[PDB]
Amino acid sequence: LRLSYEKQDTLLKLLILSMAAVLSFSTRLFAVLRFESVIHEFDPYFNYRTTRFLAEEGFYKFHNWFDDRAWYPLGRIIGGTIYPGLMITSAAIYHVLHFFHITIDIRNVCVFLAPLFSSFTTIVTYHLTKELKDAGAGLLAAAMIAVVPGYISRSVAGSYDNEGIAIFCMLLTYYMWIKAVKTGSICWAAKCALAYFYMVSSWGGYVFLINLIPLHVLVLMLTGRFSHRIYVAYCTVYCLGTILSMQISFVGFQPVLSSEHMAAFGVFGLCQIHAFVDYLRSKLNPQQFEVLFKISPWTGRFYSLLDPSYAKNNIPIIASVSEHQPTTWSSYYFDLQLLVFMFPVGLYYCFSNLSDARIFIIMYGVTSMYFSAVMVRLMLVLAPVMCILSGIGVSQVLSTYMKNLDISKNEVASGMILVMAFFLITYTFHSTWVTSEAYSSPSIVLSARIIFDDFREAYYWLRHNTPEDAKVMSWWDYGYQITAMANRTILVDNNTWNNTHISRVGQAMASTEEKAYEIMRELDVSYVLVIFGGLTGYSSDDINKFLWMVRIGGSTDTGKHIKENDYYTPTGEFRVDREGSPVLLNCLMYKMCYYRFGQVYTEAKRPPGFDRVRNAEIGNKDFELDVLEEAYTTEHWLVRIYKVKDLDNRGLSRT
Amino acid sequence: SVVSVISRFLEEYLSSTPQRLKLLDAYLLYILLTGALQFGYCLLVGTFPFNSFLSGFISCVGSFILAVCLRIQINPQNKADFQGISPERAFADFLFASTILHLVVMNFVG
Amino acid sequence: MITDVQLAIFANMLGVSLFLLVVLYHYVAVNNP
Amino acid sequence: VRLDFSITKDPAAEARMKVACITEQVLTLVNKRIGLYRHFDETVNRYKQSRDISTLNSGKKSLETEHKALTSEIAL
Amino acid sequence: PSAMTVYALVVVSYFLITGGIIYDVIVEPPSVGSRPVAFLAYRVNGQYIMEGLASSFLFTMGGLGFIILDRSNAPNIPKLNRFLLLFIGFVCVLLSFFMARVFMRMKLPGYL
Amino acid sequence: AAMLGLMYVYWTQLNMFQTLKYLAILGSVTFLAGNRMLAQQAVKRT
Ligand SMILES: CC(=O)N[C@H]1[C@H](O[C@H]2[C@H](O)[C@@H](NC(C)=O)[C@@H](OP(=O)(O)OP(=O)(O)OC/C=C(\C)CC/C=C(/C)CC/C=C(/C)CC/C=C(/C)CC/C=C(/C)CC/C=C(/C)CC/C=C(/C)CCC=C(C)C)O[C@@H]2CO)O[C@H](CO)[C@@H](O[C@@H]2O[C@H](CO[C@H]3O[C@H](CO[C@H]4O[C@H](CO)[C@@H](O)[C@H](O)[C@@H]4O)[C@@H](O)[C@H](O)[C@@H]3O)[C@@H](O)[C@H](O[C@H]3O[C@H](CO)[C@@H](O)[C@H](O)[C@@H]3O[C@H]3O[C@H](CO)[C@@H](O)[C@H](O)[C@@H]3O[C@H]3O[C@H](CO)[C@@H](O)[C@H](O[C@H]4O[C@H](CO)[C@@H](O)[C@H](O[C@H]5O[C@H](CO)[C@@H](O)[C@H](O)[C@H]5O[C@H]5O[C@H](CO)[C@@H](O)[C@H](O)[C@H]5O)[C@H]4O)[C@@H]3O)[C@@H]2O)[C@@H]1O
Ligand SMILES: CCCCCCCCCCCCCC(=O)O[C@H](COC(=O)CCCCCCCCCC)COP(=O)(O)OCC[N+](C)(C)C
Ligand SMILES: CCCCCCCCCCCCCC(=O)O[C@H](COC(=O)CCCCCCCCCC)COP(=O)(O)OCC[N+](C)(C)C
Ligand SMILES: *[C@@H]1O[C@H](CO)[C@@H](O[C@@H]2O[C@H](CO)[C@@H](O)[C@H](O)[C@H]2NC(C)=O)[C@H](O)[C@H]1NC(C)=O
Ligand SMILES: Cc1cnc(NC(=O)c2cc(S(=O)(=O)N(C)C)ccc2N2CCCC2)s1
Ligand SMILES: [Mn+2]
């Protein structure tokens, strides 16, 4: 009342912003209230085990670092193969607290760093949208960003992966570029180069930034809107950004001799070839001017995003992961509700008033949408831009219907604000439900309250009851955990940087017992860890993914007898019952995944030796492993650890 | 046959251009020449140390581009696209960008 | 600690209040003198 | 806040600031004057005034109006 | 040129993409129910062609409705035409936002 | 001039953790003096 318009306005903007921030930080906090604060899934177990070694030992003792506890015979270098972004933002955030005598743990400032960086995303989004248009349509973006279900899936409290901290860097870089294009100041461009540098060091998806920018300038150059502002900004950002990007040891000399970063360069030369021509035309006349008138190819990984079928045909490892398939009508709406509708309206409102800044948002939305269409995992990029577009659209509708009200036809004018409020509420509800029920489930804690924590008990056993120089060999999926929890030297890791060693391990499985033993001697493997999952109903059994093992071991020069369409039955169906193919019933994988199993009564009224996951009886009821004596089998038979026997003493053929 | 126009253009650019702006062009030519020499020596011998030549060449392309940016902003004629960017706030910005560029060049070179 | 249900209810209430407040802010914005 | 860190000083920008500050002083003075005059008229003219307190209130209101006129002349 | 003639193309591509055309082409799903049931039982991302194109069309309507609404507000429009245009926009908005929700519930029983 | 000299003293001897602090100090001194001189110049130009 008595408060002036200024004070009221700013106190409302501040209130709403603070509330949005708290909302975002307190909605990705479900996996912690239910189960204790522990990092989850296959990747966050490596980033953690690296940030920890970078905390105690100074940065200079981590830039170069040879980890001889992964790919045992080979050994992988962690110093120059990983983007050191997350580890230096977490080490710094931990060191500052220690300097302030907070003395927090390194496993507690490393779990709550995704939600914290999803509380700074809100502010950056609010500004990135307070630039394209009025503050009025900026807040409406922040709150929607706070509770966007697709983004929340990759940034819950416990997912220490460079994917909930990458979006923040992308937004900051875009805000810097938008400011540079809007104003043209050298300083702003610089402050963008720096953001790109802090983004090329944390997220492997920085090719987007050196491919949307050239696209943006090309469009701002084909329609005839290329002024000196864009020229100055682009050139400065290019130079500084590329030189900064080359610093990182992992990137090396990629920006200058690769076909992924050839866009920026081409647009640079076509920028000059344009500015100079304009200058010449200004100082000349039509008549005289008329008179005068090694590089590597597209790497398969990034090429798979263009051709959506290249993966299936050629790369037999990128198609394995579930989250590598095209998105359906049931993923877009499930993760983004009411945003999908808002996207066309936001586009239309942009296309209505083209400007230097907007022609960038439209390009980003058009590209990101297609990239999300090809692969479900890319939904990271899509949700923020869609949210920004949604913010620019609902607000416009509200603004259009906010002036018609007599206080500021009346019934029709209200009908819109009321419908919009109802849609916003429905969106908040659906977002909370999606975060709660589904996108929040601990990976290593199979639960139905009954808790199955075998994935931890077996690793702890390994870590405590094996010689300090074991060689636990398991599928590349579990490499990150075994080295962070079991603390052994797993033969294959999750980076899959050698497609012959992994093929080797594949061959060692789904083969005759002899061949397997022979392959399990060159690498000096001792223990063997297979995730049975049959007795508990686990969906992702080792047998379930055993097709990938047979299809990635028989695709190299070393082994070809393992050809597919041989483990199948005459009718080509993968049945693991008594009528299955004889070779299948004899491979090392199955032989070590159903050993002394055709006796347990898994179900009330079923044949003794039943399998819950495949709903079929076992074929090889009783057999004795020749080389693999048993060593441990967890209470629920969820993870079985065997141990390769040594060469026979008397030199007999067996064992 | 096409030299008359070139000479006329140069003459024009030697009367219609204010001082304290030609000097910028001279320094720009200097950078363009040091870059040309660098590239020529690279072609003549090839590159054993790649990061050495690459960062002893960017350290010139970046400077050249910063100089051109300063000439653009300083130019009074081009004071419609840039609003509120006084010449002093352009020179200081150029100095800051140059400092970053040189620091990174020093870090990258051997 | 805090029951999951409690946190969900708090999230719902906060989100609804934040959206109503955003609408109110749009009304105040248009009404500028 | 106490650090200017500005290379170029523009007169119109500072003029707007000063005019807004003056308009704030004036609005506060008008609000205070209306509150005072109304309170004096309500607390001194209930049933008996004797033309003594009313004269003092009129003098105070004239002084306030004179100060507001001086501030308006200064801003003009 | 013709800046709008581009927004039309973009909207058409958006309709084709949000109907999972990439999924259809990559992994051909039979557009049939095994009495035919259009929607898949429980898979979060399992698209039959009928579930896809039909769901997408709804989103496109859920966008054109708003565009029609905002366009109607333009002044100097006869009341007879304005009323019809606003009616169409409201019907498209409400109908798309309810049909999509019902479709989602049907595809994934236990929703909300 | 000292800032540029440092750009050479960080080549031979120093590491990226001592050069940065020195720059953080010399640059600040350069910035404050520069700003003052630039303001004076701007006033004189008008
Ligand atoms: C499956 C697969 O693949 N995988 C993979 C993996 O993966 C992974 C990953 O990684 C991970 N990650 C991490 C981080 O970890 C994960 O990931 P994730 O999950 O995913 O996560 P993230 O990432 O984060 O996230 C993700 C997300 C996503 C991404 C998202 C996305 C989104 C988006 C959006 C995207 C986008 C897309 C796109 C496409 C874009 C687009 C856009 C748009 C818009 C569209 C549009 C379009 C367009 C185009 C546009 C257009 C536009 C326009 C405008 C138009 C245009 C216009 C125009 C005009 C144009 C123009 C034109 C022109 C210009 C023409 O996870 C995953 C999984 O798990 O990874 C891995 C890695 O690790 C990988 O692996 C790798 O690989 C590689 C390659 O490969 C190779 O190989 C192959 C095969 O074969 C072979 O191999 C095998 C096996 O191995 C065998 O067996 C066989 O036999 C054979 O042999 C081949 O083929 C190829 O070729 C290749 O070769 C490799 O390499 C690697 O390896 C490596 O590594 C390993 C481990 O690490 C190791 O072990 C090994 O050994 C190796 O190592 C190496 O390397 C390293 C690094 O690399 C290092 O460190 C080491 O040491 C070594 O090194 C060495 O060697 C090398 C060889 O190469 C060399 O090179 C080096 O050297 C270098 O370096 C160094 C350092 O480093 C240096 O030193 C040097 O330098 C030096 O020397 C030189 C000589 O010359 C000189 O020069 C210089 O100077 C020196 O320097 C020195 O020195 C001086 C005195 O002297 C001083 O001064 C200074 O200082 C110093 O420095 C250099 O050179 C050495 O030697 C592996 O393996 C896998 O694969
Ligand atoms: C999902 C994939 C679907 C593919 C769809 C591709 C569309 C994505 C490109 C988005 C770019 C939007 C920018 C844009 O459209 O600019 C508009 C319209 O003017 C033009 O832009 C004309 C050129 C349009 C294409 C320019 C880039 C082409 C592809 C980029 C490499 C500006 O037009 P104006 O120049 O403002 O209007 C003038 C028209 N007169 C009649 C007056 C002459
Ligand atoms: C927001 C922007 C900042 C984001 C920070 C993100 C962290 C990324 C750092 C990744 C490290 C890349 C590799 C690297 O830094 O090189 C290290 C030197 O190591 C370092 O110095 C790391 C310093 C990290 C902070 C740098 C601030 C960047 C400001 C640019 C002016 C090696 O340098 P030195 O080992 O010191 O060189 C020794 C020999 N010389 C003669 C060459 C001096
Ligand atoms: C994981 O196992 C390794 C192998 O023993 C442990 O590394 C040893 O750590 C102790 C620290 O008390 C050192 O004194 C030894 O020298 C290390 N071993 C070797 C071979 O160098 C490591 O500590 C274990 N990780 C834990 C316990 O967290
Ligand atoms: C089995 C796997 C699971 N996850 C994996 N990692 C990638 O697939 C991947 C990695 C990079 S990268 O930047 O790390 N590159 C190594 C420099 C880029 C793109 C990538 N994919 C995005 C779409 C197709 C390729 S492999
Ligand atoms: Mn990751």
Curated annotation (Swiss-Prot), chain B:
Residues 1-27, 71-89 are cytoplasmic. Pathway: Protein modification; protein glycosylation. GO terms for biological process: apoptotic process; blastocyst development; negative regulation of apoptotic process; protein glycosylation; protein N-linked glycosylation; protein N-linked glycosylation via asparagine; regulation of protein stability. It holds the Pfam family DAD. Residues 49 are lumenal. Coiled coil: none annotated. Keywords: Acetylation, Apoptosis, Endoplasmic reticulum, Membrane, Transmembrane, Transmembrane helix. It is found in: Endoplasmic reticulum membrane. The chain crosses the membrane at residues 28-48, 50-70, 90-110. It is a multi-pass membrane protein. InterPro entries: DAD/Ost2. Its main location: endoplasmic reticulum. GO terms for cellular component: endoplasmic reticulum membrane; membrane; oligosaccharyltransferase complex; oligosaccharyltransferase complex A; oligosaccharyltransferase complex B. One of its GO terms (molecular function) is enzyme activator activity. Belongs to the DAD/OST2 family. Component of the oligosaccharyltransferase (OST) complex. OST exists in two different complex forms which contain common core subunits RPN1, RPN2, OST48, OST4, DAD1 and TMEM258, either STT3A or STT3B as catalytic subunits, and form-specific accessory subunits. STT3A complex assembly occurs through the formation of 3 subcomplexes. Subcomplex 1 contains RPN1 and TMEM258, subcomplex 2 contains the STT3A-specific subunits STT3A, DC2/OSTC, and KCP2 as well as the core subunit OST4, and subcomplex 3 contains RPN2, DAD1, and OST48. It comes from Homo sapiens. The gene is DAD1.
UniProtKB/Swiss-Prot annotation, chain C:
Residues 1-4 are lumenal. The keyword DNA damage does not apply. Keywords: Endoplasmic reticulum, Membrane, Signal-anchor, Transmembrane, Transmembrane helix. Pathway: Protein modification; protein glycosylation. It is found in: Endoplasmic reticulum; Endoplasmic reticulum membrane. It holds the Pfam family Ost4. Residues 26-33 are cytoplasmic. It is a single-pass type III membrane protein. It comes from the Eukaryota. GO terms for cellular component: endoplasmic reticulum membrane; oligosaccharyltransferase complex; oligosaccharyltransferase complex A; oligosaccharyltransferase complex B. Its main location: endoplasmic reticulum. One of its GO terms (biological process) is protein N-linked glycosylation via asparagine. The chain crosses the membrane at residues 5-25. PANTHER family: DOLICHYL-DIPHOSPHOOLIGOSACCHARIDE--PROTEIN GLYCOSYLTRANSFERASE SUBUNIT 4. Component of the oligosaccharyltransferase (OST) complex. OST exists in two different complex forms which contain common core subunits RPN1, RPN2, OST48, OST4, DAD1 and TMEM258, either STT3A or STT3B as catalytic subunits, and form-specific accessory subunits. STT3A complex assembly occurs through the formation of 3 subcomplexes. Subcomplex 1 contains RPN1 and TMEM258, subcomplex 2 contains the STT3A-specific subunits STT3A, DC2/OSTC, and KCP2 as well as the core subunit OST4, and subcomplex 3 contains RPN2, DAD1, and OST48. Belongs to the OST4 family. This is Dolichyl-diphosphooligosaccharide--protein glycosyltransferase subunit 4. The lineage of its organism: Eukaryota, Metazoa, Chordata, Craniata, Vertebrata.
Curated annotation (Swiss-Prot), chain E:
Residues 27-48, 104-112 are extracellular. It is found in: Endoplasmic reticulum; Membrane. GO terms for molecular function: protein-macromolecule adaptor activity. Keywords: Endoplasmic reticulum, Membrane, Transmembrane, Transmembrane helix. Pathway: Protein modification; protein glycosylation. Residues 70-82 are cytoplasmic. It is a multi-pass membrane protein. The chain crosses the membrane at residues 6-26, 49-69, 83-103. One of its GO terms (cellular component) is endoplasmic reticulum membrane. Belongs to the OSTC family. Component of STT3A-containing oligosaccharyl transferase (OST-A) complex. STT3A-containing complex assembly occurs through the formation of 3 subcomplexes. Subcomplex 1 contains RPN1 and TMEM258, subcomplex 2 contains the STT3A-specific subunits STT3A, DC2/OSTC, and KCP2 as well as the core subunit OST4, and subcomplex 3 contains RPN2, DAD1, and OST48. The OST-A complex can form stable complexes with the Sec61 complex or with both the Sec61 and TRAP complexes. Interacts with PSEN1 and NCSTN; indicative for an association with the gamma-secretase complex. This is Oligosaccharyltransferase complex subunit OSTC. It comes from Homo sapiens. The chain holds residues 28 to 147 of 149 of the full protein.
UniProtKB/Swiss-Prot annotation, chain F:
The chain crosses the membrane at residues 14-34. It comes from the Eukaryota. Expressed in all tissues tested. Residues 35-46 are cytoplasmic. It is found in: Endoplasmic reticulum; Endoplasmic reticulum membrane. Residues 10-13 are lumenal. Component of the oligosaccharyltransferase (OST) complex. OST exists in two different complex forms which contain common core subunits RPN1, RPN2, OST48, OST4, DAD1 and TMEM258, either STT3A or STT3B as catalytic subunits, and form-specific accessory subunits. STT3A complex assembly occurs through the formation of 3 subcomplexes. Subcomplex 1 contains RPN1 and TMEM258, subcomplex 2 contains the STT3A-specific subunits STT3A, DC2/OSTC, and KCP2 as well as the core subunit OST4, and subcomplex 3 contains RPN2, DAD1, and OST48. Belongs to the SWP1 family. This is Dolichyl-diphosphooligosaccharide--protein glycosyltransferase subunit 2. It comes from Homo sapiens (Human).
